[PDB]
Design a protein around this ligand. Structure first.
Ligand SMILES: [Mg+2]
Lengths: 124, 170, 413, 50, 203, 226, 89, 108, 212, 180, 162
RNA sequence: UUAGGAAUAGUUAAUAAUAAUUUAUAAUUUUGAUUAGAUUGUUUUGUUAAUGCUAUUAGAUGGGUGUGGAAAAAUAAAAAAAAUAAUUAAUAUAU
């Protein structure tokens, strides 16, 4: 079970045992009620396991779900961001750049005042 | 690729025919032996045209030595110690193939040459950029290693099963 | 209809800013005529335009340039006493009057020459203008103020342009300079005033322009212009020596590739200048260059500069002969716009190996041509290289004139 | 392979071209440089049969 | 390099055990030396005192073949092959041995096989490589027929004239259209051969 | 081409290899030259789970109200150092704590000494920028005894995972020039007791028995069973 | 297609792919084994390529010289017939 | 130069070209002199960058030790001179017929 | 999976922009007005300006000007240490700076500590030397750091450096400084010019006499 | 090398790629489906009147009855028949001289004809893949390796040319006493 | 609404964003159709006019030279000798970028590219008073073979010809 | 090719002219031009005794990005696309 459109693990009840899985050809997979891409994946996995290649491949579901959320046309693992109609702060109603209050941010913090009080206590 | 020749001529005409003399010119060199330096002779052979002057023979010796130890300074051509006038023709001195020509150098100077003329310059103006050899030294026909053999990959009229006509008129 | 028509419609001509506006509008008119895109414009005699003008569809291709030149003439007849008044504080400086005269002369040299039967005016208006009074007015306003000519390169181009205006329009060049440096002399020529007051050029092209103006300003006076020596080899006049030494300056002809932007026509000017300097001062050269040591520090500098200029000129001749249309025989414009560098600078290179507009930028620079020797160039250079040698030398054994003659025969066959 | 030096001469005659002397010279020298002497004599016999 | 090669072979053949130092100082870094330098130097490496010096010198010579772009010749690899019981230096790659065993066992059992020794015309030769066939199959026709208005067909067609009637022709076209062109519809005689291939096929 | 895999062999497109030549396949993209690369995703992403409960501060924010307690500042510096070290050691992080900026010492990647691979870089020069964890490093590359003639730029010198062993005898001061380490075949004489070649051309490492067992169990030759 | 097994090096990155192409040395070793087993087949493939190339060249040689002999006889007879017709004209 | 006589690689002084022919003939020319004597009409710029001095590592270790590398830039800024001062003796064996045998700093 | 044929060629290898889809449609007049109004919104320009066609980020001359024109977050420095922090940012935090700091410059910042707010400015400059600038400290760096923490009476920061010195960068800490903060000794230095044990609360116990 | 890639048919190294021997089909039902062994490009030329390089033949994938069984009864004559036509000389020209590519189904079809060995994908699932170790390979190579000149002459006969004249034929090719 | 479409593109082309933002602000307040959604904030609210700065520069003196300089509010000027050297840096940098030609524009702004204009009479329309300078409608308005069948003439002789 | 047949032009040639400031008695067209209309062409179709009449569906595409060898690039059941994924067969798609 690697592909989203090949739900291989959803057909565990469609087989009796290991021998029933490894003796069914594609016509018997069509008889059992399996869609075309899923039965093709099952048959190719069985034929790869018979040739000496176990099904050890990376599950590409979450990577494709990450790449799906962009507007690429060919699903080619690119990143194409969406451009909205207003991409600047001046057209969002904000008149000018925000001025920071330089008198409020240059005040001494509370731990500094407590340490100044402790210094005045311990100096005298 | 404009080489001023747009047809096939299998023969060579008169403007490329030159009358040449194989003039060999000697140089005084010094070789190291177990005792010390010994004076020997190094010969440079050129093909000079018959109606050329001695300054042109000196230029031909300069462009055809291919050795960094021979034309190191300004030299002068001489015969039997008597120096040669560089503005005189070879026929005015009776210079033949058997005439012994020496090149006396002055090693305190430094020969500053500027090779703007190619080594193989004929009248038809076809020069190689990577030639690196006198045209009298190189062979006439050799194997071409720079090109690549290519076969016909585009069939004209015949493409398949039965050759009826082959579309030979096309 | 030009904008200058709205400034001469009855205004107060004694105002300074009106004269400045007239001058700027006439400069704009002449520059629009000179820099006109004449790509599709054609002037062929068409029979159907006999009793009318050109067609309405063919106005911009046939009628526009002729009407522009006729408007330039009819405005020059009304304006030339406002910008350049008669010689008796001024309304216009000498530099802007010089710029107006230069654009007027550039419009006059490229006038419409072909006279159609459609034209109702005289054919004599299809001839270039005679600007003899205006060059004298500009010279009178230029000798009035000091430091009109400077050692800058823009002032070098202004010096070349003023000497050109004096050569073309029959005006003496010594009027551009004050009379105290011309005092003590009965008569001086244009080329002598050029060679006496030339600045040191920073490029080879400015020296080529100066060496061309020296030859063209003195046609039959080319003997008296550049003769600085006696018949025995002694230097007569050191002013011509100091002028000719600073013409072939080290900032112009010092590099090995100093003639990299010299075409086949400018190399003829260089070799003609070298041959004229050798021919007029032959007793000096054949005495001093062979086996003579001199104590004058100026003569050794002049001889070294002449040897360097002649050697790089012969090397450029061998470059254009033995390597025709080569990439090392290509020329370019001085301070030429190579747009690939300015496109790489004003872009963001995250990878500097990826050069933007590479297929167009590597092909395109300000004017860059493959240079080969033509017939008129090779037949002139075969004479000039033979002129560079002495009379006792054999021209048969010269290995460069023979190569030029064989190149001419091979390219003609 | 050096046999192509014999091949491109033969295709020169199948395509109705007359092989010049430089083609025979080049074929014989290319086959002699590769040690194929019988193929060079075959080029000579091709020249004689033309 | 051929001048230094004789010096190296002389220092190897004299047994002076100094040819490797001459090859390192003079021929290694500053010459395009071929593989027979190490074919000479392997005998000098063989005459070392201990076997590990011989082994390390052979391996260093192989690294010198890798670095200076001078591939080892067949003779050098066969010289190192003969002393594999002593040095144990591998001189063939992992790819060539797997090809060699599967080729050699197959060629041995194919030479010992009596059934597959018969020739196969599909495998042994090419029957014909010329662009045109060697004998006439009858085609083309070079004439029109019923329902065909286009004659000659022009591009990619062998028809040269109309089938039955034509406008008046002159010269070689008159002789061609009436006598000399191809005609496969002739029931009596096939289209003719050139001279002299028509006299011996008269009957 | 200059160097094809198995010569010209085109029964499959995989027989040519994953790259057709060590040179770049197009002239306009010089970055497509074949070289040894480094897994920068795991290496350049350092563990952010050491900065939790730690108040970092921006560079521009030097106002008084945004200042923190000096014990909190010290534990922030300790956490930032542990964050920079958490994946691996850089070249510029190892050379800063060495004498003469580590000139002459031998730097090596982790996988440069395992298997039959033997390669290190003798450091010659490092230009630190203002961000001292980055920069440009230079050195002589030594691969199986052979050494370069000139110093080459150390590729992936900014990616962590480097190691060195500091030796005082290899340290070269800023006054002198770092000499090239000698080629064991060319410069110094070959001695088997000092350096012995792990690998050579036409040599391949023998098959490990655990890899043989794993491949024969994956192919189905050995009876793998739960 | 390049196989990405589950036991490759995972790229813990939310801005791209979740698995890299960095293998295990066991994967390197078994890929080398499969490379050798393909190398045998491609060696036989290239051998049959060169064998068929030289077979085609030899067949072209033989058929070309036979065609040259027949065409030379034909063109000699054709030139003789053309010269006779020119004499009659 | 330590194995064969190079003709114009060692002089007794700087080559005296005129000031007009200085830019034309001098670039591309090399010669060795004895002692650290620099030509006139140049501005002395000593190369002290360890990134620029690292490329003389094989030159200073296997051959004569590099003491100073200087770049000479003239008044017109158009003709460089790369001056490298070596300290003898050579680590390479010098032939008696070689060019460096006629140099006092190389022979001693 | 490359963006070679999806965006223009000058956006090759381009990362870290806000949105690279903006700079593909800049030349449209509704977006060209938006670009020029954004440059007026960012300040630093006296004339209307558009960024170049083949640039996504700001140019190097314009981003240097807005970095130089940017007012510092600390306005009106009271202490000479806070004046040194503003000199530290003009020298070691300029736009595209090349020069690195010096361990002697860190000693200058640690010698001006007067109030406990100054230690937070000083120790954050100590963190930029280890983590950001990656500077090896001098042999006496822990000496200047120890006496800087004692002027403000902050001993818990001094003993915090002893339990892990190599994360902080103190490659040399002498043993008498270790014995003082751990409680083994009761003094950390012997003054050469006064011949007394510091601090002065311990000098009344140990050295009852004044020696040169 | 496009902005939006053709998602259904991706290829390698651009268009038009290397020539490949393929088995193309028709847009019909399976009951009348036949295959054309053709030589084409890697990307199919749909903008041409020349859509293929050479036509090697036709393969019929449906088995036919043996209509020639009473002619001469051989072993396995009455089985079904798979009819295929193969241009041998054009295949050898495009395979050796032009060096075409091959898909696996034309490779299997030509291995059935005796022109090629069986393909890489024709797996015997009862025999696992081989396991290589260099020590046994070196031992087998040193046990029996050929001579250098014998291997060189074998390669010269297989690759360079196979018609090298004997001495008895060189003695016949030389001229006789009126010219000798 | 046709006048606002032309006049906005002219001020954008002639590098005037204050005049173009005020045009969009004016057309949204007056109720011009097509511009009731486009309303821009006035980023030049505290800045004076451009002609008033050039009048003040000819005749507080430290603020007179830097009255044209636009600041965010969290920005401060340099010293007067240092800021004046920085203003000449931006002067030579802006003209260096504007002198470089775009290689596929034929010397035109992006407003000039694909801006062919003929009146509404050129495409199957006649006089209406509210269409002052009406651009002719595109060729996709009238498709051929939907007005008349195949091999039959349509009454549009000069429609698709631009 | 037009049931009611007349003018056309970023124009023709030369050229030391890339990137045409010049020269010319320039160029197309009543042997049918340009424009307007209809309009992919094509011994593949149909018919007949018919060199007649009648049909057609290979294709291409100067401003979307100077990238790329080539713009053909905003969407096509294969043309299997760099590890033998699978190559027994039929549905090969709905699923
Ligand atoms: Mg003309």
């Amino acid at each position: 079970d690697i592909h989203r459109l090949r739900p291989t693990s959803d057909f565990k009840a469609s087989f009796k045992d290991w021998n029933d899985l490894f003796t069914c050809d594609k016509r018997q997979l069509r008889v059992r009620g399996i869609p075309r891409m899923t039965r093709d994946a099952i048959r190719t996995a069985v034929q790869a396991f018979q040739n000496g290649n176990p099904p050890e491949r990376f599950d590409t579901k979450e990577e494709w779900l990450y790449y799906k959320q962009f507007k690429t046309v060919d699903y080619s693992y690119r990143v194409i961001p969406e451009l909205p109609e207003k991409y600047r702060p001046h057209q969002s109603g904000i008149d000018q750049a925000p001025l920071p209050d330089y008198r409020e941010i240059n005040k001494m913090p509370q731990w500094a005042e407590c340490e100044e009080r402790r210094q005045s206590k311990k100096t005298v | 690729h404009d080489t001023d020749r747009h047809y096939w001529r299998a023969v060579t005409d008169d403007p490329r025919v030159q009358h040449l003399i194989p003039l060999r010119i000697r140089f005084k060199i010094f070789t190291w032996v177990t005792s010390g330096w010994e004076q020997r002779m190094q010969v440079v052979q050129i093909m000079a045209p018959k109606d050329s002057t001695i300054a042109q023979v000196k230029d031909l010796v300069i462009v055809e030595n291919q050795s960094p130890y021979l034309c190191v300074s300004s030299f002068h051509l001489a015969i039997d110690g008597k120096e040669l006038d560089p503005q005189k023709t070879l026929g005015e001195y009776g210079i033949t193939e058997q005439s012994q020509i020496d090149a006396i150098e002055q090693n305190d100077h430094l020969l500053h040459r500027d090779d703007e003329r190619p080594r193989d310059w004929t009248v038809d103006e076809i020069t190689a950029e990577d030639v690196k050899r006198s045209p009298y030294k190189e062979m006439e026909m050799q194997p071409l290693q720079n090109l690549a053999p290519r076969y016909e990959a585009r069939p004209k009229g015949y493409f398949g099963r039965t050759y009826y006509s082959g579309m030979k008129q096309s | 209809p030009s904008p200058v028509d709205e400034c001469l419609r009855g205004g107060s001509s004694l105002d300074k800013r009106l004269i400045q506006e007239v001058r700027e509008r006439f400069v704009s008119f002449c520059r629009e005529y000179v820099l006109m895109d004449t790509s599709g414009m054609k002037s062929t005699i068409l029979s159907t335009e006999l009793n009318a003008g050109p067609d309405y569809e063919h106005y911009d291709r046939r009628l526009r340039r002729k009407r522009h030149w006729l408007a330039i003439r009819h405005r020059f007849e009304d304006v030339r006493y406002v910008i350049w008044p008669d010689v008796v504080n001024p309304s216009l400086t000498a530099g802007e009057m010089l710029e107006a005269l230069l654009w007027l002369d550039a419009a006059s040299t490229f006038c419409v020459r072909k006279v159609h039967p459609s034209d109702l005016g005289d054919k004599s208006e299809f001839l270039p203008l005679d600007l003899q009074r205006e060059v004298e007015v500009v010279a009178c306003h230029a000798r009035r103020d000091l430091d009109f000519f400077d050692p800058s390169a823009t002032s070098l181009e202004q010096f070349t342009a003023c000497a050109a205006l004096c050569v073309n329009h029959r005006v003496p060049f010594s009027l551009f300079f004050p009379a105290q440096d011309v005092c003590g002399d009965a008569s001086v020529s244009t080329g002598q005033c050029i060679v006496a007051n030339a600045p040191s050029p920073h490029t080879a092209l400015g020296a080529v322009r100066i060496m061309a103006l020296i030859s063209e300003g003195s046609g039959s006076d080319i003997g008296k212009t550049i003769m600085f020596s006696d018949a025995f080899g002694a230097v007569t006049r050191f002013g011509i020596l100091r002028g000719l030494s600073r013409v072939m300056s080290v900032e112009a002809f010092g590099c090995k590739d100093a003639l990299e932007n010299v075409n086949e026509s400018e190399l003829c000017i260089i070799l003609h200048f070298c041959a004229e300097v050798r021919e007029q001062n032959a007793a000096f050269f054949r005495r001093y260059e062979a086996s003579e040591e001199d104590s004058d520090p100026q003569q050794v500098s002049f001889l070294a500069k002449y040897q360097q200029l002649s050697q790089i000129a012969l090397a450029r001749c061998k470059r254009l002969l033995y390597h025709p249309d080569s990439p090392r025989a290509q020329v370019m414009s001085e301070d030429g716009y190579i747009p690939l560098v300015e496109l790489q600078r004003h872009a963001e290179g995250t990878n500097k190996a990826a050069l933007i507009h590479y297929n167009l930028g590597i092909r395109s620079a300000q004017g860059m041509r493959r240079v080969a020797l033509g017939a008129q160039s090779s037949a002139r250079l075969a004479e000039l290289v033979s002129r560079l040698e002495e009379a006792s030398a054999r021209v048969s054994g010269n290995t460069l004139v023979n190569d030029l003659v064989h190149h001419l025969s091979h390219k003609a066959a | 392979i050096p046999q192509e030096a014999l091949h491109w001469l033969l295709r020169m005659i199948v395509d109705n071209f007359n092989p010049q002397h430089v083609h025979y010279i080049a074929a014989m020298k290319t086959l002699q440089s590769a040690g194929e002497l019988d193929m060079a004599r075959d080029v000579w016999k091709i020249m004689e049969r033309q | 390099a051929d001048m230094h090669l004789q010096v190296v072979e002389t220092m190897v053949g004299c047994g002076t055990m100094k040819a490797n130092d001459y090859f390192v100082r003079n021929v290694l870094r500053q010459f395009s030396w071929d593989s027979r330098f190490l074919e000479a130097l392997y005998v000098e490496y063989r005459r070392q005192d201990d076997v590990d010096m011989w082994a390390e010198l052979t391996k260093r010579a192989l690294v010198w073949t890798a670095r200076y772009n001078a591939p080892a010749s067949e003779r050098l690899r066969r010289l190192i092959e003969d002393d594999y019981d002593t040095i144990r230096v591998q001189t063939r790659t992992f790819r060539e041995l797997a090809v060699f065993q599967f080729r050699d066992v197959e060629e041995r059992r194919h030479s010992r096989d009596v059934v597959n020794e018969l020739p196969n015309p599909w495998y042994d030769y090419v029957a014909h490589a010329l662009p045109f066939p060697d004998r006439d199959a009858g085609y083309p026709d070079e004439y029109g027929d019923l329902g065909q208005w286009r004659a000659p067909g022009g591009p990619g067609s062998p028809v040269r004239g109309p089938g039955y009637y034509a406008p008046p022709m002159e010269g070689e076209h008159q002789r061609g259209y009436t006598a000399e062109w191809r005609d496969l519809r002739n029931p009596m005689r096939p289209p003719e051969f050139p001279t002299p291939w028509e006299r011996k096929y008269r009957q | 081409r200059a160097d094809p895999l198995n010569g010209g062999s085109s029964m499959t497109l995989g027989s040519k290899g994953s790259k057709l030549s060590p040179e770049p396949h197009r002239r306009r993209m010089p970055w497509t030259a074949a070289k040894e690369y480094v897994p920068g995703v795991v290496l350049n992403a350092r563990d952010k789970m050491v900065l939790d409960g730690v108040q970092l501060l921006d560079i521009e924010s030097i106002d008084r109200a945004s200042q923190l307690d000096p014990l909190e500042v010290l534990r922030a510096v300790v956490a930032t150092r542990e964050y920079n070290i958490s994946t691996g050691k850089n070249i510029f992080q190892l050379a800063s704590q060495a004498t003469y900026n580590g000139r002459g010492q031998r730097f090596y990647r982790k996988e440069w000494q395992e298997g039959t691979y033997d390669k290190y870089v003798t450091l010659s020069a490092i230009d630190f920028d203002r961000d001292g964890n980055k920069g440009t490093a230079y050195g002589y590359i030594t691969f199986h005894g052979e050494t370069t003639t000139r110093p080459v730029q150390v590729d992936f010198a900014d990616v962590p995972g480097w190691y060195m062993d500091f030796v005082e005898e290899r340290a070269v001061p800023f006054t002198g020039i770092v000499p090239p380490p000698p080629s064991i075949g060319t410069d110094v004489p070959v001695d088997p007791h000092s350096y012995r070649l792990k690998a050579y051309p036409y040599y391949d490492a023998p098959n490990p028995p655990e890899f043989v067992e794993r491949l024969l169990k994956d192919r189905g030759v050995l009876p793998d069973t739960p | 297609r390049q196989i990405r097994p589950y036991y490759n090096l995972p790229s813990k990155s939310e801005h791209g792919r979740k698995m890299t192409g960095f293998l295990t040395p066991y994967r390197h070793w078994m890929w080398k084994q499969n490379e050798l087993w393909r190398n045998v087949h491609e060696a036989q493939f290239e051998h049959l390529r060169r064998v068929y190339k030289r077979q085609w060249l030899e067949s072209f040689r033989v058929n070309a010289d036979e065609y040259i002999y027949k065409y030379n006889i034909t063109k000699a007879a054709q030139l003789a017939q053309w010269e006779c017709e020119m004499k009659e004209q | 130069a330590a194995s064969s006589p190079v003709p114009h690689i060692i002089g007794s002084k700087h080559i005296d070209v005129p000031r007009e022919h200085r830019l034309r003939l001098l670039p591309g020319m090399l010669y060795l002199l004895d002692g650290d004597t620099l030509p006139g009409e140049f501005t002395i710029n000593r190369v002290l960058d360890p990134t620029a001095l690292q490329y003389y590592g094989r030159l200073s270790s296997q051959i004569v030790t590099v003491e100073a590398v200087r770049m000479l830039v003239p008044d017109d800024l158009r003709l460089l001179c790369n001056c490298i001062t070596f300290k003898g003796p050579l680590h390479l064996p010098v032939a008696p017929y070689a060019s460096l045998a006629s140099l006092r700093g190389a022979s001693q | 999976a490359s963006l070679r044929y999806r965006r223009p060629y000058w956006m090759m290898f381009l990362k870290g922009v806000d949105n690279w889809k903006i700079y593909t449609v800049i030349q449209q007049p509704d977006h060209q007005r938006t670009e020029m109004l954004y440059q007026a919104w960012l300040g630093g320009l006296d004339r209307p300006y558009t960024r170049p066609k083949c640039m996504a980020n700001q140019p190097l001359w314009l981003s240097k000007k807005r970095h130089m024109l940017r007012k510092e977050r600390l306005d009106g420095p009271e202490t000479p240490l806070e004046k040194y922090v503003l000199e530290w940012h003009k020298k070691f935090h300029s736009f595209q700076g090349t020069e690195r700091p010096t361990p002697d410059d860190l000693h200058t910042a640690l010698d001006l500590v007067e109030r406990p707010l100054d230690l937070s400015y000083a120790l954050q400059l100590l963190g930029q030397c280890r983590n950001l600038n990656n500077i090896r400290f001098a042999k006496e760096t822990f000496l200047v750091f120890l006496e800087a923490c004692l002027r403000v009476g902050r001993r818990d920061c001094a003993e915090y450096a002893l339990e892990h010195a190599e994360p902080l960068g103190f490659w040399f800490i002498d043993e008498d400084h270790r014995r003082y903060l751990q409680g083994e000794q009761t003094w950390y230095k012997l003054s050469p010019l006064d011949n007394l044990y510091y601090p002065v609360e311990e000098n009344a116990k140990l050295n009852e006499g004044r020696k040169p | 090398a496009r902005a939006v890639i053709k998602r259904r048919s991706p290829q390698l190294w651009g268009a038009p790629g290397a020539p490949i021997i393929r088995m193309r089909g028709h847009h019909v039902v399976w009951k009348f489906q036949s295959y054309d062994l053709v030589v084409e490009h890697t990307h199919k030329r749909r903008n041409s009147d020349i859509r293929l390089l050479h036509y090697l033949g036709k393969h019929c994938p449906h088995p036919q009855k043996s209509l020639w069984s009473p002619d001469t009864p051989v072993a396995q004559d009455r089985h079904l028949f798979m009819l295929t036509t193969v241009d041998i000389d054009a295949f050898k020209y495009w395979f050796g001289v032009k060096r075409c590519r091959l898909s696996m189904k034309p490779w299997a079809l030509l291995a059935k004809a005796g022109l090629l060995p069986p393909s890489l994908t024709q797996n015997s699932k009862i025999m696992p893949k081989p396991l290589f170790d260099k020590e046994s390979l070196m031992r087998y190579y040193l046990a029996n390796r050929k001579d250098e000149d014998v291997m060189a002459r074998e390669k010269y006969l297989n690759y360079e040319n196979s018609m090298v004249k004997t001495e008895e034929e060189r003695a016949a090719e030389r001229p006789v006493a009126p010219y000798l | 609404p046709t006048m606002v479409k032309f006049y906005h593109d002219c001020l954008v082309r002639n590098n005037r964003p204050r005049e173009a933002s005020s045009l969009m602000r004016l057309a949204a307040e007056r109720g011009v159709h097509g511009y009731e959604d486009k309303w821009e904030a006035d980023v030049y609210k505290g800045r004076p006019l451009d002609s008033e700065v050039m009048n003040e520069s000819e005749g507080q003196a430290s603020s007179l030279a830097f009255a044209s300089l636009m600041l965010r509010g969290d920005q401060r000027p340099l010293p007067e000798n240092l800021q004046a050297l920085l203003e000449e840096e931006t002067t030579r940098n802006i003209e260096a970028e504007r002198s470089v030609p775009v290689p596929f524009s034929a010397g035109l702004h992006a407003t000039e590219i694909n801006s062919v204009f003929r009146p509404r009479v050129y495409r199957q329309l006649w006089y209406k008073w509210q269409h002052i300078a009406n651009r002719y409608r595109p060729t996709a308005a009238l498709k051929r073979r939907q007005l008349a069948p195949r091999d039959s003439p349509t009454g549009i002789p000069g429609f698709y010809r631009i």
